[PDB]
Copies of this chain bind each other. A is one copy, B any other.
Amino acid sequence: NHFEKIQIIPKSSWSDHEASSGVSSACPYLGSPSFFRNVVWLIKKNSTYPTIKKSYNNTNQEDLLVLWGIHHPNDAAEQTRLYQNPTTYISIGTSTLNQRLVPKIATRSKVNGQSGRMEFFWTILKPNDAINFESNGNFIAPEYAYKIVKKGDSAIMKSELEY
Residues of chain A whose beta carbon lies under 8 Å from any beta carbon of chain B: 53, 55, 72, 91-95, 97-100, 104-109, 111, 117, 119, 129-130, 132, 134
Contacts and interface: CB of A to CB of B under 8 A. Distances in A.
Taken together, the copies of this chain in the complex come to: 2
Sorted from nearest, which 6 A-B pairs have the closest CB atoms?
A93-B108, A91-B106, A100-B104, A93-B106, A107-B132, A95-B109
Contact of A134 (B97, B106, B109, B134): B106
Given A98-B72, A117-B98, A104 B132 contact: no
Q: Interface SS of chain A: helix, strand, loop or mixed?
A: strand
B93 A98 contact: no
Given A104-B100, A117-B98, A109 B92 contact: no
